[PDB]
Amino acid sequence: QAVVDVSSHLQKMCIHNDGTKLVMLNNLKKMTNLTELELVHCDLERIPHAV
Amino acid sequence: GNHFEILPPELGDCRALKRARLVVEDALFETLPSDVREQMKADA
């Protein structure tokens, strides 16, 4: 949730796990100001709903 | 820091305004035409 504290102005975020599944996507929905998103090796296996 | 989506080519009409004086988002600047941004950065 710390990223939600910076989501008011952050426009680029690039999180690249080494295989860990990004199981939850609740905080990512708070990224209104985001214009660039990179989900690298997040093991989602499906199109994320937060995007 | 604003909610701009596409920057119109009219930004290239400002002779005194250049890229250094242009404070825009990278995506905002990329919405400018290639000729406009090339004039913005250099003499093309």
Side-chain angles (χ1 to χ4, degrees), chain A, chain B residues 1-20 22-42 44:
Chain A
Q1 199 265 349
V3 194
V4 190
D5 304 323
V6 68
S7 61
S8 55
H9 49 267
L10 188 75
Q11 59 172 340
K12 182 179 182 56
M13 185 137 147
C14 299
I15 88 175
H16 324 302
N17 320 339
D18 53 354
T20 314
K21 182 173 181 59
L22 200 58
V23 289
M24 61 53 86
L25 307 166
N26 186 22
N27 297 327
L28 192 58
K29 306 179 180 183
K30 296 301 179 179
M31 259 275 149
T32 302
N33 290 82
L34 192 71
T35 56
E36 314 176 22
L37 173 58
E38 295 182 9
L39 299 181
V40 169
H41 203 36
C42 291
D43 200 8
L44 307 172
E45 302 291 337
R46 271 303 182 92
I47 298 185
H49 192 68
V51 164
Chain B
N2 292 255
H3 314 80
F4 291 108
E5 329 326 317
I6 318 84
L7 297 202
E10 302 280 342
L11 292 177
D13 298 3
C14 307
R15 308 181 315 171
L17 173 64
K18 293 193 298 183
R19 223 295 179 184
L22 186 67
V23 190
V24 293
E25 318 284 357
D26 313 339
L28 267 53
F29 185 78
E30 200 166 2
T31 54
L32 288 175
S34 182
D35 299 331
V36 170
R37 67 181 309 174
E38 280 175 349
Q39 180 180 356
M40 212 34 182
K41 296 183 300 180

